[PDB]
């Protein structure tokens, strides 16, 4: 379950997920988007090459449909590279 994409940085979030900070990006491909999660510099509008683990992260909504809230996980072998 490895992913690799290239696109423009559309949005940047500095957030929290249980006693740990996290930086997230909205990556605009071609036109679609996917969230990048990280547990010369990466800026707003940066055209970047991203590689990491693709998580589907399916959740139930309170029918009770089951939708996907997918994102790319990034850690030594995961990276976000400006280009």
């Amino acid at each position, epitope marked *: 379950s490895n992913a690799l994409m290239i696109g423009r940085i559309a*949005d*940047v*979030q*500095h*957030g*929290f*997920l*249980g006693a740990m900070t*996290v930086t*997230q990006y*909205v990556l605009e491909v071609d036109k679609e*988007f996917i*969230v990048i*999660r990280c547990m010369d510099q990466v800026k707003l509008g940066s055209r970047v090459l991203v590689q990491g683990t693709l998580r589907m*992260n399916r*959740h139930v909504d*309170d029918s009770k449909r089951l939708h996907a*809230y997918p*994102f790319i996980q990034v850690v030594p072998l995961g990276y976000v590279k400006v280009v």
Partner: nanobody, 127 residues
Framework: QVQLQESGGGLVQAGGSLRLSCAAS????????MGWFRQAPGKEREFVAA????????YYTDSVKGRFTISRDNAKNTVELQMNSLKPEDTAVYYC????????????????????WGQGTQVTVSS
């Protein structure tokens, strides 16, 4: 676009309690992280509390931990600030804010990242 309408504030004595309510209307579909901010005169907006879209994740400024509680009801498109054990320190104009960053579980803690703002509700605590 998006309106955030606030209520529940007012004047109370110290040790007293209030329940703030932020109601969202407009295109609530684009809203994800919700947060409460406050501003005392002279000083600038400080982060009080914020909550993820799924409600699973919350973050509090140190001074309000244990005293204030944040929850949300997405079906009603509302977020609440349960304020217990109010201190005079807590006197400020309280604002709710909404974030457009499309994420379900991650809570936004940076102020410049919140994209929509309420008009503000006055909270005064007398000692």
């Amino acid at each position: 676009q998006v309106q955030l309408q606030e209520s529940g504030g007012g004047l109370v004595q110290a040790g007293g309690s209030l329940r703030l309510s932020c109601a969202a209307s407009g295109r609530t579909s684009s809203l994800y992280s919700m947060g409460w901010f406050r501003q005392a005169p002279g000083k600038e907006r400080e982060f009080v509390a914020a909550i993820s879209r799924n409600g699973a994740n919350t973050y509090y400024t140190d001074s309000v931990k244990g005293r204030f509680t944040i929850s949300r009801d997405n079906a009603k498109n509302t977020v609440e600030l349960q304020m217990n054990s109010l201190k005079p320190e807590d006197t400020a104009v309280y604002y709710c804010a909404a974030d457009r960053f499309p994420t379900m579980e991650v809570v936004t803690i940076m102020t410049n990242e919140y994209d929509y703002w309420g008009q503000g509700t006055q909270v005064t605590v007398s000692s």
